[PDB]
Amino acid sequence: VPLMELSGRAPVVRLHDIEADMAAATDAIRSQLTGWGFMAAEVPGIGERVEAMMNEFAAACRATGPSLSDYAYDVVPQLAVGGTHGFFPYKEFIHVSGAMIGDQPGAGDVLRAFPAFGTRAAEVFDIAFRLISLFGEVVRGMMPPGTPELDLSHDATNLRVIHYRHEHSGIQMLALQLPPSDQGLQYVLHDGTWVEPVIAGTDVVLCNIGRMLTSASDGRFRPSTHRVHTKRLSSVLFAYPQHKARQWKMVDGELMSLNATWGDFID
Ligand SMILES: [Fe+3]
């Protein structure tokens, strides 16, 4: 599979000028979505933070005082409506939701138990959530006039960090793939050929179209289908709108509100 270099070629988006740099990057990002099926930006300094956060997650995965299994999803308080946050034991991974970060009470306890990792995770979540909301504004700008705002929800969005680990697409609106520890993540292009973005140990983030946005755009943007081929840590932000909010669809340039909610779409 051909390597795809992105360092030094993707638009640069600085941590303290995110809104303005994403405005400047807008045309480059539109052209990536048109030309590739997924988007990319280089965020100087993001790699340092992600690598530290992942290394602290790896260390937490082996800790046996207030261990991570103590915060497995089935013993963590969950929202009445919404996805499932907490730790998923064994290949082993954690879902750090926006709700968890605001302690919505006791859901925040895994971050109190592992505050070094938890502080990095909250920091990465906030950066990733600002970036991905602006990616969503870019995609919205490519859709017909009258397209509603994506309304990605802070509390419904989650940062997944995977320890240890086929072609697939996410069910969410958008995802932001943060630089993983190792190479192997691969994306299919519009022509059906596979490429391997060079992202391990870089400052490059990728933005994935999810199947909610495929539905909302009525097939205009296919999901950013990808797979993972190895020879290990990875993190990704999965962004969702409010579960109770009403689905919509731009069909033939015309906005349509459906009876089903975004929560129904997931089921
Ligand atoms: Fe994935």
Distance 146 CA to ligand 1 centre (A): 30
Distance 183 CA to ligand 1 centre (A): 14
Distance 169 CA to ligand 1 centre (A): 6
Gap between the Cα atoms of 92 and 70, Å rounded = 14
CATH architecture for the domain at 3-266: Sandwich (2.60)
Gap between the Cα atoms of 93 and 121, Å rounded = 13
Gap between the Cα atoms of 178 and 122, Å rounded = 14
The residues, ordered by sequence, that sit 6+ positions from 252 with a Cβ below 8 Å of its Cβ are 218
The residues, ordered by sequence, that sit 6+ positions from 179 with a Cβ below 8 Å of its Cβ are 46, 47, 50, 51, 199, 200, 201, 202, 203, 204, 205
**Annotated binding-site positions:** 160, 164, 168, 226, 232, 234
Distance 145 CA to ligand 1 centre (A): 30
Output the CA angle 236-176-231, nearest 5 degrees.
Answer: 55
Distance 199 CA to ligand 1 centre (A): 15
Gap between the Cα atoms of 150 and 213, Å rounded = 9
Gap between the Cα atoms of 128 and 147, Å rounded = 23
The residues, ordered by sequence, that sit 6+ positions from 139 with a Cβ below 8 Å of its Cβ are 33, 150, 174, 209, 213, 217, 221
User: Order of strands across the sheet with 194-197?
Assistant: 3-4, 194-197, 185-188, 226-228
Distance 98 CA to ligand 1 centre (A): 19
Distance 105 CA to ligand 1 centre (A): 29
Gap between the Cα atoms of 39 and 139, Å rounded = 10
Neighbours of 199 (CB within 10 A): 25
**Annotated binding-site positions for Fe(3+):** 168, 226
Largest CA distance in the chain: 57
Gap between the Cα atoms of 38 and 196, Å rounded = 12
The residues, ordered by sequence, that sit 6+ positions from 197 with a Cβ below 8 Å of its Cβ are 4, 6, 40, 185, 186, 187, 204, 206
**Annotated binding-site positions for 2-oxoglutarate:** 160, 164, 232, 234
Token pair, residue 169, equals 């697409």
Token pair, residue 233, equals 């840590």
* Spatial contact of 223 and 164, defined as CB atoms under 8 Å apart: no
Q: How does DSSP assign 181-210, residue by residue?
A: SSS-EEEE-TTS-EEEE--TTSSEEEEEEP
Distance 254 CA to ligand 1 centre (A): 31
**Partners of 93 in beta bridges:** 88, 162
Which helix (H) or strand (E) covers residue 3, if one does? strand 3-4
Distance 30 CA to ligand 1 centre (A): 21
